[PDB]
Amino acid sequence: EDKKQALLEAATQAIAQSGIAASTAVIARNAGVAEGTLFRYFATKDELINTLFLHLKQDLSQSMIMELDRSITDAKMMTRFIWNSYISWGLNHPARHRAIRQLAVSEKLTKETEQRADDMFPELRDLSHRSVLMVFMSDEYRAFGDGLFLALAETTMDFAARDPARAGEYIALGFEAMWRALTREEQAA
Amino acid sequence: DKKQALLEAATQAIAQSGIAASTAVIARNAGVAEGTLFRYFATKDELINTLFLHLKQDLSQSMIMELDRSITDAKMMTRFIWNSYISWGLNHPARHRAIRQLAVSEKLTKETEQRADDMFPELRDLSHRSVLMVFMSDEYRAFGDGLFLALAETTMDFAARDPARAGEYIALGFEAMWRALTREE
């Protein structure tokens, strides 16, 4: 498994730098195993993509479970906790964030992986904290939704990293911006 | 002109590698050694600012073309503005990527910021009206633009990857940016 894990870390780095296009040969060389070993563990580029999205999401969920709390809590409290966890994770593990973002907006994630990934987070039970637009987006435009979220989260991380004196402000502003985006609803004449 | 070839090469270089892009290759790909480039622009900072302005002027041209002024809803106006911006980015990806890098650089003089405000006065007024104050402030204007350009680039990337649904992506992205960034009732 030692070998498989080194491969996952190498794929993370490769995709972080070059996206889904990253070569299987380069991943294997940067693991220090020939490309055949790689295709033994993962039988396809797709199977690897999916396994890596899940491995990375598990890593995220691990960093959170330390401070995980009960569902009877404000949806904004829970969502801010998730967002702060994510930002901390991306700052500590930039390649992990970059890779996972690439994976998320790939059109390559099986529904099985999507269900496993929902089930890493009991928290993804919307309970209409979301607006009507975004519940509609979750059905029809889920990748675009995640894309937008990760865009806001990455902008947050980049500014925090560039100017940590203001990190908390940025994390706050970014959070509110995504929260309004996710939660604010139509106001009519 | 020669200057224009330099600016277009600088756009391409920054689109690819950000502000770090070397003056040497910008000059090389313009077809001139570095001294010529430094003749036209005496600093990287001066070049950064001059290019931000050249690019914003291009954007402002492409937007002001399509504007009709009978419209007065601020969400209507901003939605058309965003359609124009998304169009420009789709048509000129290097120009968008570069302008985004330049915008969130901490390298833009206040003179450059006001000249660029004054390319589209109507958009600056639109923005003081509609945008939250934090994202408009002196201290967090850059973060606001960062968020905006993030959403705009995600919109562009999805539209480009899947043009059959481009309008859907442009609409949704707009709403997301609007709700995120703008003051409420």
Residue numbers in the entry:
A (entry chain A): 7 to 195
B (entry chain B): 8 to 192
What does the paper say about this structure?
We incorporated a boron-containing amino acid into the protein scaffold RamR to create an active enzyme for the kinetic resolution of α-hydroxythioesters.
The overall structure is very similar to RamR without a boronic acid residue, but additional density at the para-position of the phenyl ring at position 59 clearly indicates the boronic acid residue, which seems to be mostly in the tetrahedral boronate form. A closer look into the hydrophobic pocket reveals multiple amino acid side chains in the vicinity of the boron residue, including a lysine residue at position 63. In the crystal structure, Lys63 lacks a clear electron density, indicating that its side chain is significantly disordered. However, the lowest energy side chain rotamer in a sterically favorable conformation available to Lys63 allows the formation of a direct interaction between the side chain ε-amino group and the boronic acid of pBoF (Nε(Lys63) to B(pBoF59) distance of ∼4.0 Å). In the 11B NMR spectrum, a chemical shift of 18.3 ppm for the boron residue was observed, mirroring the results of the crystal structure and indicating partial boronate formation under reaction conditions. Notably, the K63A mutation gave an inactive enzyme with a complete loss of catalytic activity (entry 3). Based on these observations, we believe that the canonical amino acid Lys63 and the noncanonical amino acid pBoF59 residue may form a hybrid catalytic dyad, in which the lysine acts similarly to serine/lysine dyads during the hydrolytic reaction catalyzed by certain serine peptidases. The term “hybrid catalytic dyad” refers to one canonical (Lys) and one noncanonical (pBoF) residue in designer enzymes that are in close proximity and are both essential for activity and selectivity in catalysis. Likely, Asp152 has an unproductive interaction with Lys63, and removal of this interaction leads to a large increase in catalyst activity.
